[PDB]
Design a protein around this ligand. Structure first.
Ligand SMILES: COc1ccc(C(=O)n2c(C)c(Cc3cccc(O[C@@H](C)C(=O)O)c3)c3cc(OC(F)(F)F)ccc32)cc1
Ligand SMILES: COc1ccc(C(=O)n2c(C)c(Cc3cccc(O[C@@H](C)C(=O)O)c3)c3cc(OC(F)(F)F)ccc32)cc1
Lengths: 256, 245
């Protein structure tokens, strides 16, 4: 059995690497220096932002993240297909699982690109500071803060990509998502993912007491970030009527 | 050291039994025949017979009265948890402040089936349908608890399981304003260790029960958040003081 669970962990890590071009390991090598990777150009004010790119600031940056989210949903969707059992589920439920799982996964993986000071951008080529994001115009200045506050706590667990691979899989296969037709097949997959995760954390973090429990508890903070994020999008759509929002992102948010 | 975790487990069950008059075992007995007055509509409610009487408002007032009683039961229980009373007193207050609602909804689940909720120490039964039939926005007060309860109860936890789970909720190191997170997480790790051993022993046939129970903590925080937004509204002055939170 436990040999089977190591095989699952290995499968998931493999697909993760295949699906997500900027891993936590690459992110950390960029963020902390040095030699395997290269140093980011740092955006920290209106000056550096102009010198950095080679209509207005906050909205343009907002469209930037909006476009990254779309790529992220594309990568996540590719990864979900690799989770054993996922593609065999009722198609409606595949859609439901992705619809609800995707943003919880975006914020988990976004934490890999973050430290307390800011976030990696343009595939690790850039680094935008938390302060600069926080200084942005009235509604946009609030978008990233909750993600930074999560990242700081989440990053304290010291998870690596092989851990995150299984964790993200656990998130996607939640049998407690609204409007799931066949809850049981989903729960049977998740049960196995949870077993695999537990063994993986035991093995990878032997000195780390109750890391499994401490990680599942983080799923609480993920839910709150989603709620807050979609509230701000409501504000943006009514205040910026000329603002375009990607169809993929359109039908994900609609009917939380 | 798993004989010490069975000790902790037992200590916590012992205290829970002391602290909460209506146990899950007791409530399930009442709910599945082992007889309460039933409240299903306006006329059986009027006949039904409370300490809070000073329709939708009277029911909501009753729920708040009961919540205030429950806070003190939970406060008494928290004192039993090895290490809790040795915490900084501000942190004890913080842990209780943010944890009681989560525990109220957890424990309310023990008193609910999909059809209604035991009321008044199990002497009564208010139907789920009577509760949603109430005027807006009072008919939306209790439905999200029934949704959670039905899901939660499907875990089939017993009182000795819940005694440890509730302790785990109290000792959460992520409450805002905690001054000394270390001993709290130190205690909770112990309790999580005890909870895991309890569920392995009490439910050997359900593999990731531990995990599934911990995933229910997100459903709980969600519920508590939704509930406090419904409390946004948008009275006797002394009464209004008793029911601040
Ligand atoms: C698959 O999981 C993820 C994949 C990619 C990313 C990612 O690269 N992102 C980055 C660096 C960001 C941060 C960011 C900030 C400012 C501008 C950005 O656009 C450009 C410059 C870029 O990074 O390519 C990007 C990001 C934001 C996102 O929207 C949010 F979830 F926060 F609502 C979504 C993904 C984001 C995060 C999670
Ligand atoms: C220690 O945790 C608990 C202890 C007792 C109870 C409980 O008996 N309650 C019942 C049956 C109820 C359900 C109920 C419905 C209508 C009137 C009620 O008031 C009286 C009749 C009563 O429960 O004694 C009670 C209850 C509701 C509460 O407010 C709420 F959480 F829902 F916001 C709080 C506690 C409630 C719940 C949790």
């Amino acid at each position: 059995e436990s040999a089977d669970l190591r095989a699952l962990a290995k499968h998931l890590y493999d697909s993760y690497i295949k699906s997500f071009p900027l891993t936590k390991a690459k992110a950390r090598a960029i963020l902390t220096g040095k030699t395997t990777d290269k140093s980011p150009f740092v955006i920290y004010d209106m000056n550096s932002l102009m010198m950095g790119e080679d209509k207005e600031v906050a909205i343009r940056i907002f469209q930037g993240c909006q476009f990254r989210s779309v790529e992220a949903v594309q990568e996540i969707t590719e990864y979900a297909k690799s989770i054993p059992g996922f593609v065999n589920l009722d198609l409606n439920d595949q859609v439901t699982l992705l619809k609800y799982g995707v943003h919880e996964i975006i914020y988990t993986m976004l934490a890999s690109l973050m430290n307390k000071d800011g976030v990696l951008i343009s595939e690790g080529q850039g680094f935008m500071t938390r302060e600069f994001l926080k200084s942005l115009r009235k509604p946009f200045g609030d978008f990233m803060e909750p993600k930074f506050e999560f990242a700081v706590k989440f990053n304290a667990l010291e998870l690596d990509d092989s851990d995150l691979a299984i964790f993200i899989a656990v998130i996607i296969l939640s049998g407690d998502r609204p409007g799931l037709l066949n809850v049981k097949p989903i729960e049977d997959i998740q049960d196995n993912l949870l077993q695999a995760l537990e063994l993986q954390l035991k093995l990878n973090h032997p000195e780390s007491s109750q890391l499994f429990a401490k990680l599942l508890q983080k799923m609480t903070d993920l839910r709150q970030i989603v709620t807050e994020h979609v509230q701000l999008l409501q504000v943006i759509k009514k205040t910026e009527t000329d603002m375009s929002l990607h169809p993929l992102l359109q039908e994900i948010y609609k009917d939380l």
